[PDB]
């Protein structure tokens, strides 16, 4: 499973 993308947390 892919790690969550920090971009969905901070822009």
């Amino acid at each position: 499973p892919p790690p969550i993308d920090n971009g969905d947390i901070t822009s």
Partner: antibody
Amino acid sequence: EVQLVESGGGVVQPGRSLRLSCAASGFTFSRYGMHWVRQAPGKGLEWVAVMSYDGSTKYYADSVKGRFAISRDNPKNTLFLQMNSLRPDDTAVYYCAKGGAAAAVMDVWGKGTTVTVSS
Amino acid sequence: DIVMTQSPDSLTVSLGERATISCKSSQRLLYSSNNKNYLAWYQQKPGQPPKLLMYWASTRESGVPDRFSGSGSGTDFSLTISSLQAEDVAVYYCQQYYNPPWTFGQGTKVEVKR
């Protein structure tokens, strides 16, 4: 430089609620996800919850899921934690934490606010 | 949920000597698609809030002195303080951020032997 000041801690009776705040300064609050993390006295760090930059995304620890609600107010540069159904094991320092640019880490921490659940 | 286990619970080091803190993840923290390890280290000196030391296993945060080295890949990680100084007494925490819930190792206390 970046500053996070927590507030709202104190003592609460078992069963009741408490709302914490985090006043962020020294960066564009609108662009960053923010976390709540806690530490029972003499104990380890425990991630509580996070809310994304624009507020459309949350995640909670299982420990608090359904009991706690993270929210934020971007124009007022403020992060909140609404805590419900508190128990003595929720007793802890509650740190507000800023997310890294960078990587999903907490790069800056407030000093925390101390919450005590007791009779 | 990814479980992070540190070893040991406590180190007592002579000034100028080496402290080695181990951190073991229950899940591979390496992402094939970018070859980065989603692992961080934090330092929390007594009475203070935590500070971020390392991320992507080995990238130092700004201001972190160069006696601190983060390394490892996969499930097995390490924080080494070469040549320990008095300031460095603290509890050190590893943390995965591969996936929610963000999870911390239990902490490793470091003290000086004198």
